[PDB]
Amino acid sequence: LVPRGSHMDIRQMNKTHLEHWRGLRKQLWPGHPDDAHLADGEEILQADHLASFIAMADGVAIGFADASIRHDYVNGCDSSPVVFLEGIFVLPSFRQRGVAKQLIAAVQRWGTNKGCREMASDTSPENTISQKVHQALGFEETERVIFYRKRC
Amino acid sequence: LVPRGSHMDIRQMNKTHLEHWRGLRKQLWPGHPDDAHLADGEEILQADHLASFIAMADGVAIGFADASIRHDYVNGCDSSPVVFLEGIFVLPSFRQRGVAKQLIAAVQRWGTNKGCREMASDTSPENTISQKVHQALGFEETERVIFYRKRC
Ligand SMILES: CC(C)(COP(=O)(O)OP(=O)(O)OC[C@H]1O[C@@H](n2cnc3c(N)ncnc32)[C@H](O)[C@H]1OP(=O)(O)O)[C@H](O)C(=O)NCCC(=O)NCCS
Ligand SMILES: CC(C)(COP(=O)(O)OP(=O)(O)OC[C@H]1O[C@@H](n2cnc3c(N)ncnc32)[C@H](O)[C@H]1OP(=O)(O)O)[C@H](O)C(=O)NCCC(=O)NCCS
């Protein structure tokens, strides 16, 4: 069978996606231990406010997005709760083809169905590609900020 | 009575502080309507996770701080929940005297007693004075980021 190509599926990560997801995520956060990633998957799966999305193509995972629902203050946002995009990543060899586009779309649709008026997100200044992408997908830059931590 | 000066009290904003607080806050967020500020005071007062602190000096309000407890992800933080410093402001004519220092201290002590391992905060790049202050009070700059919003 050849006149076509071979479909891509954006699916919500359930437990049978845990290794595909872990595999891609190790490349978004190289520095976060396999154990850590596993812990996270468990947490995500079970939580009402956490969701992930995997973009499967011909039985393999080529991109994912990590969304959460924020009930706290959220830089540049007017309403609550907010659908935040915590992490999105598409295998190099599949970028600029609308994958992250669909992934982000499925993170919006999830957050809409969960009450969220706005889909927030964030990126690093050194991340120009990320910055552009956000703009291309209709995200408006709201504010830039510096964060601090102090132990209690 | 003269050999001394005249004590300053950092107190947690209850309802009999609502106009002193509103008065100072109008100068942190000029652009937020008196109505809005009032709404906020009500909300703060009643919520388990919201707290404010007023620095009273000789019966008048000279500085305040707005803290919240964050249960969502928090840029540059390792634990949850986090005591976030949403807003701090000290009348011009009282800065550089340790007021914000005590105010921030009382926001830490509140957030400690509420489980928080870390006290987070944030500021704008154009805010050099804020930036310095944070450093002086032992806050380490964790990360800088750009935020985005998209409607759902
Ligand atoms: C951000 C990232 C997920 C984008 O993936 P993607 O597959 O390239 O996304 P899309 O192809 O759907 O791009 C959507 C839009 O961004 C633009 N864009 C994508 N890649 C771009 C690039 N590398 N440089 C400039 N513009 C780019 C597309 O042209 C545009 O399409 P449009 O014609 O509808 O405007 C990224 O490439 C990634 O996979 N790697 C690093 C992870 C990262 O940056 N994370 C961000 C938050 S954690
Ligand atoms: C940030 C602000 C609250 C500081 O108030 P403050 O009364 O001056 O704070 P403190 O005097 O307790 O200062 C603590 C430390 O910061 C330093 N500092 C204070 N003001 C400073 C200034 N104007 N320039 C440089 N360093 C400064 C103090 O020297 C230092 O004391 P230390 O000897 O213990 O290191 C500010 O001045 C304010 O009131 N106005 C604008 C509001 C704002 O910037 N908000 C920030 C987050 S919403």
From Swiss-Prot, chains A, B:
Sequence positions that bind acetyl-CoA: I88, F89, V90, Q96, R97, G98, V99, A100, K101, N127
Endpoints of the signal sequence: none
Gene Ontology MF terms in the entry: aminoglycoside 6'-N-acetyltransferase activity; protein homodimerization activity
Gene3D superfamilies per the UniProt record, alphabetical: 3.40.630.30
Enzyme class: transferase
Residues involved in substrate binding: W29, H32, Y73, E86, D122, E143
The protein's role, per its UniProt record: Catalyzes the transfer of an acetyl group from acetyl-CoA to the 6'-amino group of aminoglycoside molecules conferring resistance to antibiotics containing the purpurosamine ring including amikacin, tobramycin, dibekacin and ribostamycin. Able to acetylate eukaryotic histone proteins.
NCBIfam families: AAC_6p_group_E, AAC_6p_Salmo
Name of this chain's protein: Aminoglycoside N(6')-acetyltransferase type 1
Organism: Salmonella enteritidis
